[PDB]
Amino acid sequence: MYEMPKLPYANNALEPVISQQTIDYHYGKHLQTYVNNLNSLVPGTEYEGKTVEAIVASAPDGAIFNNAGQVLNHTLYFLQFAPKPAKNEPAGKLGEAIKRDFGSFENFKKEFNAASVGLFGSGWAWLSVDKDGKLHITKEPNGSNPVRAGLKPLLGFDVWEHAYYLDYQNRRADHVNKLWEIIDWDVVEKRL
Amino acid sequence: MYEMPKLPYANNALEPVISQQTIDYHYGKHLQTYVNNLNSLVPGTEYEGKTVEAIVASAPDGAIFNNAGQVLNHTLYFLQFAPKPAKNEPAGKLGEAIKRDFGSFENFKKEFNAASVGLFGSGWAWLSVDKDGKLHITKEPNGSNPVRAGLKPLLGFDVWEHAYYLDYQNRRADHVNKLWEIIDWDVVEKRL
Ligand SMILES: [Fe+3]
Ligand SMILES: [Fe+3]
């Protein structure tokens, strides 16, 4: 019932920022496994027939949450990138909210990089919006996603080692610095 | 105060099970960073003058515990391996305790592999002994180590992706299966 999300670009199209090798493993093996696992774990449970978002919003810690969170996180992650983005910062309401909540986009980038690099272990740095329009940076452990806390996820950096280890090894910060160049802000803006 | 532990073998000596590349990054970069961080974080705190082990036993969750736990974990990890072990299973008191508590060494291996593969995200599978001589398998998240719970750690498998990603990518189970052939049971026995 859960299917792989189609990439809007070729597996090597994010080069030189993310290698084809990383996309091949990260999308083709890790995300495939999360989808496979979710399909294996939901039969016989009331989570069968639920969207990944509904599961992430409701399930306690466990294998189903872990895999549904990872399916949601990776879907949002791969689909927020483009080979050659038209713009390299957000405009519109998101641009305005970033100014309001972080002072400037440049300062948001600093804070978001810091959260990404500071997360100990596996997880995700997320920029989300709450139901009243305020932005939040969160460190989501392991497979967690801000939907659990009732936030709407906008931009997610995967800092599981598999996201970067083939390209950057231990140098997480060097990886995170490069991601800005491939963010499709048109997609991110429309998550508000 | 905190120094890198001397490796008892050359960086390529665990080949073909663990590559030189993995030792170069895992020991030379990851463990170096954890030791560096502990040296940066501990001066001027209640932890100054304490051994790594004492810190792991006493510190609450936070950056000091994360780094001290990882120093302890990795120290025990590297020192429990040898290029060409004389035997491939424990004898003596350890051998007897494994039979007692797990039925056989083969069943211990099955349970330990299962704990290793089942740990979601970053962490460690640990075999430890309690005050009564009973053995336990624990899944320690992130930088945790059984010393916190007053258990004495005997054998630890690192299932952070950096431990295996360069050699096995996503195939953690295939990595864990190979570790058994480089365990130095002479060292592990003397931990009991
Ligand atoms: Fe990932
Ligand atoms: Fe490690």
Residue numbers in the entry:
A (entry chain B), B (entry chain A): 1 to 192
Copied sentences from the primary study:
Here we studied metal-preference evolution within the natural diversity of the iron/manganese superoxide dismutase (SodFM) family of reactive oxygen species scavengers. Only a few metalloenzymes have been rigorously demonstrated to be cambialistic in vivo, including some iron (Fe)- or manganese (Mn)-dependent superoxide dismutases (SODs; SodFMs); metalloenzymes that play an important role in cellular reactive oxygen species defence. To study this process, we leveraged the existence of naturally Fe-specific, Mn-specific and flexible Fe/Mn-cambialistic SodFM homologues, which differentially utilize these metals to catalyse the detoxification of superoxide. By combining phylogenetics, biochemistry and structural biology, we demonstrate that SodFM metal utilization can be evolutionarily fine tuned by sliding along a scale between perfect manganese and iron specificities.
We identified at least two independent emergences of cambialism in this group, once from Fe-SodFM2 and a second time from Mn-SodFM1 ancestors. Next, we leveraged the cambialistic SODs from S. aureus and B. fragilis to investigate the specific role of the XD-2 position in determining metal preference. Therefore, our results suggest that the S. aureus cambialistic SodFM1 has potential for evolution towards higher Fe preference, whereas the B. fragilis cambialistic SodFM2 has reached the highest possible level of Mn preference via mutagenesis of the XD-2 residue alone.
